Write a protein that binds this ligand. Sequence first.
Ligand SMILES: [Fe+3]
Ligand SMILES: [Fe+3]
Lengths: 445, 443
Amino acid sequence: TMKVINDPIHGHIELHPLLVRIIDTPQFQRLRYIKQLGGGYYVFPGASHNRFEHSLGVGYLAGCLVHALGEKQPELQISERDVLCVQIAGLCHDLGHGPFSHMFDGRFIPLARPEVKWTHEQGSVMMFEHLINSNGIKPVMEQYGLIPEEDICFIKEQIVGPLESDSLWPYKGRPENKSFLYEIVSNKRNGIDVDKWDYFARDCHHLGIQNNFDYKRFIKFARVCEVDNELRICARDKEVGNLYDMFHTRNSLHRRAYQHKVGNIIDTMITDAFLKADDYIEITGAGGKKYRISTAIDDMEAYTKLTDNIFLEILYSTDPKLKDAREILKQIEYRNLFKYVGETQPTGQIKIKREDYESLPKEVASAKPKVLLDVKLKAEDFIVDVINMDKNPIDHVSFYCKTAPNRAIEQLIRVYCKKVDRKSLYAARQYFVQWCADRNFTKPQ
Amino acid sequence: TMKVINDPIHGHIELHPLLVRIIDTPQFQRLRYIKQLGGGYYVFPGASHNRFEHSLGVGYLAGCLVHALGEKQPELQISERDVLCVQIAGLCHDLGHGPFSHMFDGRFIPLARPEVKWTHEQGSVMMFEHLINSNGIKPVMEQYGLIPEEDICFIKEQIVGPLLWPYKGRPENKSFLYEIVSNKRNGIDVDKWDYFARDCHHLGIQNNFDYKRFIKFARVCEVDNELRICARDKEVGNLYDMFHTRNSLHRRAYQHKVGNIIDTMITDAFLKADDYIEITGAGGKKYRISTAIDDMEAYTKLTDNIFLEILYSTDPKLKDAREILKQIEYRNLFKYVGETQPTGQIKIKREDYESLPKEVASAKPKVLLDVKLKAEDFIVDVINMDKNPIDHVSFYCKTAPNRAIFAEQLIRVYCKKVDRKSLYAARQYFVQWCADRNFTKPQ
Ligand SMILES: [Fe+3]
Ligand SMILES: [Fe+3]
């Protein structure tokens, strides 16, 4: 039946039946309720897009890439099984994302369970297992040629990396003669996945930013080529221009959107409300076990029901135990947001870790501003946001000469105050410039 | 002093402080949680847009058009007061929509409370009143030049209509101001200019209308001694493209066969939960999905979230409704039986919607069947809609500027039993019904 979907970025998108059986599941439809840019919608009206449309776009591009490669280089032995496998992986890369996307894995779980190590990617593999175990997708895979064991491995390894983790070949879903396949959906080495292609295009389409690259061109002029004796997705030397444009694009999206002063403040605000509500909201999981926002990631049956909905559940609650949290959201509505204090950077290659996120506010309040301050602030009154951004650009990308196509030719720390009196704002700036100095961080300007 | 927002459609929208005060309220922010195409999102994966962005765009377009009209025609005498009122009309236009937009007032309320007469436009007037009274906006309006009495009247009339010049908000010499946010005559208002563009941009359809061009070559001319907004002859081309865009959107999106079934499925889950869903209102009064339209304190909290409340619900009372929605996830949707029209007959009325399923199941298919379906098994979807329009438009010529120059009802039937035998029985019942109701013969 090959269902066709009309997407705003990719136009008509043909979907194989296995891809549909997966999409039409509770586990997968969950992304229809998780905004892609998270809190960015409270700054960009156009950012109403959710992770569902993204996951579809990534599946469509991942397949376009493998199929084009296999058609131009039959030697590579790219099979239709491989095509379908890469498609499913790109279709589930974000299946593990939580409410408001990055807010959840980058700031919420870190401040809620600092001892835990959670990643949207780990979550993706776990939800994939849940999806294929709760919707009997295993037999459907066999029916369409896939080899369940081997192929499920291949897909998960495409989403999270060598599972079993100067040596040899670490993957176990596919051999080394097909290494290039592991570079389509997620590849931070060259920093060019098909995921980034879709998210750049779509976040640009909806946010209002101009997209300068043309994924279609790459897909056409792409070719597997030998680099340091390894099969790698290379591209013609003429695409350098397009690549630079793509990097420009990436930079613009980060500066104007992903690192937006207010959008990030609204993120820390929502996170605060969640933390204040974490001891009261109940997400029912397996066997009725009542998980919490922070603990729901331990039972995929509940993480299925953990979406952006929680936000409104909080806003519309009557439970007095959720007043604190609810009022934070009410603040957002009225636009009585946290007040920006300053911005600093770690020194050297130091990078603050998630396990130490909860400590940052306290260190700020425990500082001793030289000039004695009238008002004394406490941590609870402080918010410390750590913004991560992921090296010369085109030098790390591989290229091939058209005559011989087979061969080849970071952290921002922002401090915001929950109090708005001119007084407390001045005191926060003092505590902040101190924390920077006594932790050896750049001089706030 | 201002407040620039960045929209993918209009670009850099500048927002006057009064507008920003109206926007930053729980009442206006509730529109960030009501999808525009409602059921469409389940068919068009990029139709995730909500009414909030639409509202901002209508506000912007309204100001763009009035301010320009006045700049070129000072004779008309348009004040910043008029612009701020028209702007507010644009913003609050949709304040009254309900869960999954047009589904709420066009099918759910009519099927749960046939006796009631609720329109989203009425609810917009109610929520606008609630907004300005709950967030002390009246003194702010006075601070920026408005006359709360008259001006709120002008805004409310601009949304719902009159209440021989039938308006108390503004006099007749300013009648053109009432054709910006909603002109039911020429089908040209900024609410359409926006929703066309934005919907096209999220659906994957192309929009060939350059609203900027109209706003440019647009002036106010007289017609039958009535000041109206007319376009330049050089815009006919543009207007034609507009009229195809509309049709395209209607044929391809608004009237989509599955998007429509999915909507009637949503309404079926809401109807199976109304009695069990509580919405705290004024004074703690608990309201139901179908009664929150009576108290705006409750209505303010009635958004699409209700969809996810039922889905994540554990109350066994809600199980039935949960299953309906679970089908939408699993894509085990209602099946399309057929379509018809009431040509040369009386049009179907909302108060009768509820009654329809039983009529269909009461039909006596001429050839007896092996399967007997029940009224609970049918779903009757009445699709209403609002000629050669380019003629209904008014036009002017540069030389002498001052001077001038689709079906109505679609009844569709879906079946819940999806086996062959049942769908066949359904087609028989439906054909019979169409016949003994003198409705067009099902194709
Ligand atoms: Fe992604
Ligand atoms: Fe509208």
